[PDB]
Design a protein around this ligand. Structure first.
Ligand SMILES: *[C@@H]1O[C@H](CO)[C@@H](O[C@@H]2O[C@H](CO)[C@@H](O[C@H]3O[C@H](CO)[C@@H](O)[C@H](O)[C@@H]3O)[C@H](O)[C@H]2NC(C)=O)[C@H](O)[C@H]1NC(C)=O
Ligand SMILES: *[C@@H]1O[C@H](CO)[C@@H](O[C@@H]2O[C@H](CO)[C@@H](O)[C@H](O)[C@H]2NC(C)=O)[C@H](O)[C@H]1NC(C)=O
Ligand SMILES: *[C@@H]1O[C@H](CO)[C@@H](O[C@@H]2O[C@H](CO)[C@@H](O)[C@H](O)[C@H]2NC(C)=O)[C@H](O)[C@H]1NC(C)=O
Ligand SMILES: *[C@@H]1O[C@H](CO)[C@@H](O[C@@H]2O[C@H](CO)[C@@H](O)[C@H](O)[C@H]2NC(C)=O)[C@H](O)[C@H]1NC(C)=O
Ligand SMILES: *[C@@H]1O[C@H](CO)[C@@H](O[C@@H]2O[C@H](CO)[C@@H](O)[C@H](O)[C@H]2NC(C)=O)[C@H](O)[C@H]1NC(C)=O
Ligand SMILES: *[C@@H]1O[C@H](CO)[C@@H](O)[C@H](O)[C@H]1NC(C)=O
Ligand SMILES: *[C@@H]1O[C@H](CO)[C@@H](O)[C@H](O)[C@H]1NC(C)=O
Ligand SMILES: *[C@@H]1O[C@H](CO)[C@@H](O)[C@H](O)[C@H]1NC(C)=O
Ligand SMILES: *[C@@H]1O[C@H](CO)[C@@H](O)[C@H](O)[C@H]1NC(C)=O
Ligand SMILES: *[C@@H]1O[C@H](CO)[C@@H](O)[C@H](O)[C@H]1NC(C)=O
Ligand SMILES: *[C@@H]1O[C@H](CO)[C@@H](O)[C@H](O)[C@H]1NC(C)=O
Lengths: 23, 49, 257, 371, 49
């Protein structure tokens, strides 16, 4: 179970769809 | 991996103030040295994956 | 004018358990579904409150160190207000709260009171329902004067057939004096109701004076109803407060119980 | 251009192939906005400047003032006061200054004597009955009153102090009528040689010259900031704008943000809504009692995506996590713009053909330099 | 005092009481124009605003 004040969250290069394909 | 993060060190330390920003200028490279570190962490989350 | 009655000696205090009460919104800040670790003057959980009741009649003077929780369970409007101050003898300014039949007055003059000062249901005195006056001689320096509607007004509850709980917290910080309050109906004979609700800031006033002691004001060779009242002292303490989905505090933890 | 910004950021005249961070983007405030509850408890200055009868100066009236808005908009913007001066504050700046107490001192004097009311002055009024302290920071206000306070035979109701044992301290009201000793003899009984009653009444008649005419004098005074600010000037307010980035002040809470209509319902006693990390995320409008969401104005890192320097000078720009509707507030010409899960990507051509990942962008997107 | 003061007052020496805005560092002001402290304009030499 999982922007403000100049803090940022960036996406991973591989999406959860691409990881599901390699898997 | 873990969640990639990056910070605008000035927006954190100095939100919407030029008066603070011109004082932050007295401290030199730390607001870049911090981002080199966090971008190094972020690039490695792709590498690990 | 004073109507003295040293008829009753200083009978010793009853004492009871204040289970989980006198929690109040520390600030005007809305939150939702989240736990807040406020540090402030609070009534400690499960602490010994002092207890008094109205041939049954009580009205003792007592101190007000940093702040005080006050309450009654009642019907038919026996209690009407409070004096707070430091000398209580015109060497210094004081603060009077009183509710009348609907309205409130909150006022501050260079009051002289009396040894045993009160306001009853005036029938005569000067004449019928006489003005907020019999607790003092002359204010003569009434710089602060505020008035309101039904500060402690009654609610339906099938003509209030339960002894309704009326809770107040009186505080001072940075020269403001702050009042927080709640009404709740409950069914209990003579003790503070074990359960949880929280008090909201009813009013603030910026009176800015040293305050040390206080005494409640209540109404009646004479005859009257009978009801209880309680007093507890705030202490500095950390509380963790559960704000619900609608903001209102729904439960608390006393971090040093 | 964005390539020049990478050269400056990398401190190199030539830049290798890759993606480089540059100065962060942030949607600017479109305008400032000030919200305060519409003025209501305006101070009782009608009970001063428009009271029908004034007091005599030997026993000058004092009115104390508290718990109100010290508005002088009708006051200082009227020429109807013939001498209104302030002595430690600018009369313009009073609307942005707070007080603590206020007192109005109200009385009638002759026009030759209005000059004596100023701090650090002398003459039988200033000497004997009404002296300001020399450090008086407040103001004296006065107006010609020959139409008001004169009587056809002389208005000998209006009395002044003609004698005193010693010249007085600040604001020392004296109500004594006991006989003055002008000579070295004791004065005994109501009258005698060198005995004088300490007062006389002014002869205010409609005929008098610009000097023997009556004036209505008020001093506005205050002892400052030792206590909560129970008297202060009118906190002005401006129109409520929405759905734009703006510099707000709500009842003293500052911030720069996008304001939006909230679905959150407060209980009546609250004004600031906060999030988990004790940051403001909503506010009540003081004058309309509705809740506004506060959202921080859109911002992001700007990354420049490039083939190497000698290879080519052409570059593309990624506005990280910015919606492409918002970037044109700044390459705002567009025509090759692609909203990606990673941000608004500007100046790179979207091609359906999947190649191997060359330069990473994020969320499955990569970029490369090709035909 | 004993160089620039005079028994009747040395009214040669003067300060600027009024300025629309604060002057900048090492700025000098030689304007003698009449300061409109009230709204009503004064294309003239005198008046109570
Ligand atoms: C003493 O009390 C008087 C009554 O309150 C007050 O008079 C009022 O003054 C204002 C400003 O001069 C006038 O405001 C109106 O002026 C014109 C119409 O003449 C309009 O364009 C404006 O919008 C505004 O409505 C009031 O009309 C006027 N009222 C009366 C009954 O005369 C004096 O200003 C007060 N004087 C002092 C010294 O306190
Ligand atoms: C009550 O009256 C007393 C006496 O008039 C006030 O005490 C004066 O307070 C002012 C303001 O600080 C001082 O300048 C005086 O020197 C004080 N006089 C004396 C004799 O103490 C007091 O402030 C008044 N309180 C209220 C609330 O009005
Ligand atoms: C928060 O308060 C609201 C309003 O009192 C509650 O929503 C009400 O729920 C009852 C019972 O289902 C309905 O009769 C009302 O129509 C609802 N009100 C509205 C405005 O929709 C809500 O249940 C409360 N939440 C909590 C957790 O107590
Ligand atoms: C502040 O003043 C405005 C203007 O008098 C008030 O707005 C009026 O409110 C009523 C009831 O909502 C409406 O019938 C009017 O049409 C409104 N007029 C305007 C011009 O908006 C407002 O209610 C006041 N607010 C407070 C907090 O006092
Ligand atoms: C960028 O912002 C726009 C709004 O300005 C978003 O457009 C809305 O998208 C939802 C979901 O598809 C639709 O229900 C709305 O009708 C759209 N609004 C308009 C005005 O077209 C857009 O989705 C945003 N893009 C991203 C990826 O966040
Ligand atoms: C509570 O009060 C009783 C007296 O009624 C006393 O015996 C007891 O020790 C007190 N306990 C605490 C924790 O104050
Ligand atoms: C009380 O009595 C006085 C005269 O004794 C009278 O003037 C006044 O109106 C009365 N007040 C009421 C409320 O009846
Ligand atoms: C209530 O008290 C206030 C202040 O004493 C007074 O102005 C008001 O008229 C009173 N009203 C009644 C109903 O007694
Ligand atoms: C009351 O206030 C005065 C002045 O602030 C202070 O010196 C004194 O100690 C105070 N007394 C008490 C009992 O707090
Ligand atoms: C540009 O420089 C690189 C080395 O950095 C070299 O390999 C390449 O051949 C050069 N390109 C041209 C067109 O000269
Ligand atoms: C590429 O294919 C998508 C469907 O996957 C389509 O929506 C888009 O229009 C195509 N673009 C071009 C340029 O043909």
């Amino acid at each position: 179970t999982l922007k403000f004040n100049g803090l940022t969250v960036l996406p991973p290069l591989l999406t959860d769809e691409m990881i599901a394909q390699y898997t | 991996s873990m969640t990639k993060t990056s910070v605008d060190c000035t927006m954190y330390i100095c939100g919407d103030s030029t008066e603070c920003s011109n004082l932050l200028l007295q401290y030199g490279s730390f607001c870049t040295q911090l981002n080199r570190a966090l971008t190094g962490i972020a690039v490695e989350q792709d590498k690990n994956t | 004018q004073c109507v003295n009655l040293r008829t009753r000696t200083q009978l010793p205090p009853a004492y009871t358990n204040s289970f989980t009460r006198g929690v109040y919104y520390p600030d005007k800040v809305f939150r939702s579904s989240v736990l807040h670790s406020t540090q402030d003057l609070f009534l400690p959980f499960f602490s010994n409150v002092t207890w008094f009741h109205a041939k049954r009649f009580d009205n003792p003077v007592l101190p007000f160190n940093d702040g005080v929780y006050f309450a009654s369970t009642e019907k038919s409007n026996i209690i009407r207000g409070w004096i707070f101050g430091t000398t209580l003898d015109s060497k210094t300014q004081s603060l009077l709260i009183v509710n009348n039949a609907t309205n409130v007055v909150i006022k501050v003059c260079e009051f002289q009171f009396c040894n045993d000062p009160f306001l009853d249901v005036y029938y005569h005195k000067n004449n019928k329902s006489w003005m907020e006056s019999g607790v003092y001689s002359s204010a003569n320096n009434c710089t602060f004067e505020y008035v309101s509607q039904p500060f402690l007004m009654d609610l339906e509850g099938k003509q209030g057939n339960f002894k309704n709980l009326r809770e107040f917290v009186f505080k001072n910080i940075d020269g403001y004096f702050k009042i927080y309050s709640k009404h709740t109906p409950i069914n209990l004979v003579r003790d503070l109701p074990q359960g949880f609700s929280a008090l909201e800031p009813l009013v603030d006033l910026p009176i800015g004076i040293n305050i040390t002691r206080f005494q409640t004001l209540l109404a009646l060779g004479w005859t009257a109803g009978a009801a209880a009242y309680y007093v507890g002292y705030l202490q500095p303490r950390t509380f963790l407060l559960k704000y619900n989905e609608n903001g209102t505090i729904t439960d608390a933890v006393d971090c040093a119980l | 251009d964005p390539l020049s910004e990478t050269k400056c950021t990398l401190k190199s005249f030539t830049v290798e192939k890759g993606i480089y961070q540059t100065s962060n983007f942030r949607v600017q405030p479109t305008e400032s906005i000030v919200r305060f509850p519409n003025i209501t408890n305006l101070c009782p200055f009608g009970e001063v400047f428009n009271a029908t009868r004034f007091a005599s100066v030997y026993a000058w009236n004092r009115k104390r003032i508290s718990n109100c808005v010290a508005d002088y908009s009708v006051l200082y913007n009227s020429a109807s006061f013939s001498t209104f001066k302030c002595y430690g504050v600018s009369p313009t700046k009073l609307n942005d200054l707070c007080f603590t107490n206020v007192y109005a001192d109200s009385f009638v004097i002759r026009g030759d004597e209005v000059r004596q009311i100023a701090p650090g002055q002398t003459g039988k009024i200033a000497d004997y009955n009404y002296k300001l302290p020399d450090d008086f920071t407040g103001c004296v206000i006065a107006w010609n009153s020959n139409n008001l306070d004169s009587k056809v035979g002389g208005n000998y109701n209006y009395r002044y102090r003609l004698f005193r044992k010693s010249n007085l301290k600040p604001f020392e009201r004296d109500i004594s009528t006991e006989i003055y000793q002008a000579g070295s003899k004791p004065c005994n009984g109501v009258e005698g040689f060198n005995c004088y009653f300490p007062l006389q009444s002014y002869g205010f008649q409609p005929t008098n010259g610009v000097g023997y005419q009556p004036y209505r004098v008020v001093v506005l005074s205050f002892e400052l900031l030792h206590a909560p600010a129970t008297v202060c000037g009118p906190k002005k307010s401006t129109n409520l704008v929405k759905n734009k980035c703006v510099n707000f002040n709500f009842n003293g809470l500052t911030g720069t943000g996008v304001l939006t209509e909230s679905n959150k319902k407060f209980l009546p006693f609250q004004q600031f809504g906060r999030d988990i990390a004790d940051t403001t995320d909503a506010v009540r409008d003081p004058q309309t009692l509705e809740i506004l969401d506060i959202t921080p104005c859109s911002f992001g890192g700007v990354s420049v995506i490039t083939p190497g320097t000698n290879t080519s000078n052409q570059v593309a720009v990624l506005y990280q996590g910015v919606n492409c509707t918002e970037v044109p507030v700044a390459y705002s010409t567009g025509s090759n713009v692609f909203q990606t899960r990673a941000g608004c990507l500007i100046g790179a051509e979207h091609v359906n053909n999947s190649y191997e990942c060359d330069i990473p962008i994020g969320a499955g997107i990569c970029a490369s330099y090709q035909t």
